[PDB]
Amino acid sequence: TELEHWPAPAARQLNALIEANANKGAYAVFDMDNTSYRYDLEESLLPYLEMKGVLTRDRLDPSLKLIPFKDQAGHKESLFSYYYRLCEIDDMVCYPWVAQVFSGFTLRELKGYVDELMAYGKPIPATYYDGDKLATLDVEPPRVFSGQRELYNKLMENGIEVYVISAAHEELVRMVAADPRYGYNAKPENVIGVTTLLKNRKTGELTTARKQIAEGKYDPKANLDLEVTPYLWTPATWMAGKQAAILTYIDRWKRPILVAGDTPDSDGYMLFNGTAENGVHLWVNRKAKYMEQINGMIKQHSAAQAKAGLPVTADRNWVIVTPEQIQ
Template identity: 60%
Template sequence: MKFSRTSQAAAIWLAGLVAVHAAPSFNATTNGTAPMLLRHWPPAAAAALSEMIVRNANQSNYAVFDMDNTSYRYDLEESLIPYLESIGVLTRDSMDPSLRLIDFKDTANYTESLYSYYLRLCDMDEMLCYPWAAQVWAGMTLRELKGHVDNLMALNSSLPVQYWSNETLVDDSVSPPRVFTAQAELYNVLMANGIAVYVISAASEELVRFVASDPVYGYNVPPENVIGVSTFLRNATDGSLTTARRQITDNVYNPDDNLDLVFGPYLNTPATWFAGKWAAILTYIDDWKLPVLAAGDTPGSDTYMQFHGVDVSKGGIHLWINRKDAYYEELQEMIAEAAQGQAENGREVTADKNWVVVTPEEIL
């Protein structure tokens, strides 16, 4: 494959990985018609993305994105938990009893926060804390939680937190999500060129939808295209249970009609973390058609859908948000292992092809 925009982009693309560190500026033309602008991306990344979009525009293709730390900076659930604790909305007493998985670690001078409790679950096993963070909203209505998410997103400051790290009590802070301007731009350019955008998140589907599908935040993802950790929702009047995913399948989904439904603690499947992200693509998007772009930031959680789910034959892109050196080093090892596994099993080697890598600072 060869890029026509810049020889620099072509050389980096053919090398397999794109790492860019320049001011964002790029204009392209889609099939000689309306201008396609990726002004907020570094030039080499913009060129790579634009070439892919031009090649795949208006052919029923689609792209998939992780949300936390990929589409916006920071983590929604990990900031919403301490935020709701700080205003007295989320407490031990309000938490569904089924979510008290281990004892709280209290001392004479410290009452453990739910945020600290969540982190200790993560230390034990991510398969404990990932679902817990989606279930802890049980008992709240979608309308109530949407208001809290909007208030969190409007904060201009970080949130103080205390948590246990082994036997040491740590004082720290967490930041609310901050929209990656370049990602919101990319979402809209993809959709304007007939490439559907789906969010595949390991966070609560409804929480992510509150941001990804609200025009205020600029992503403009159709609400039915937001796929995350799904819990059953209860009608407080008649006690009936449903999920957005069931409603979407039955063609009866209207997000506004769900606002007074109550979050429940019971999980729907597939669970959208690790291999479950790839399972969600197969379940809800397409059994066979691969995305032309898969974006992520976390080894393991995002790489199943990236290694298995990018159609490199169409110039598809593995988009990586490089937020930690340690994660990037781990990614390189995983890429090498995946490519070796493909080769050893007689599969086309695609895992090490067409990576575009940017840092969070480059896309804010």
């Protein structure tokens, strides 16, 4: 596999790193949404299922009705719009919530919807509230980044283990990252994301893939008819939780030789704290506000590293691309 869909300087660096680190027990970590593919799985699957009338205020787990709905005589507030209002309280509210909102469905069912969504290829209209007025928006379904697909594979081929650490529900992400049809070929056990309790509707048994994996009894097929529940397992794989996830599920001491992200706060803990001294920070720049945020973080963290007596690595080996460069 070769790095076709990459700017050549980006390709040279990745090639250097891959070559330097081949077959030595090394590993890499990718965020998923807007990093491994363009756009956002949950943020499109949610308004997609609403549109299909599958996911409605009526079926939403009561534990997720955290605030009153904002209904106009004209209009019932959508789940999508409710989500946006949850994020205005805080990221730490709406991040779990937008994974939990898929509770009530079995994995088989969600898998049908993900693939439906993945093949949809049209924008999905969603309504929200710009302050007080009903605004509207089209949300793109996810689009595989050819470059990431290639890099995932070339890493694997050179004996570099590939992990996904995602702020999205681990089961949803796995439905794309680990299904060969999408071409990433991640190992399903190597997909790490937001985990909620899965419930056996016959026995009442509660389980999660992370527990099965830690116990060495993971069977993905056996989980298909389990129902997603909202109850949150941890580490919650966002912000410092991404670094917690690496320590918990990957390695306590060995650092990834490559970390990929796109959201400065969500991905910055694993980018800055996780990435090995000589590893690459892979960055999908999709937004100026974000590019600026991460540049200030590079400056603050480089100075803090020096002040703390650590080698300055926060500013080393950035490989920065835009979505269009790797599509």
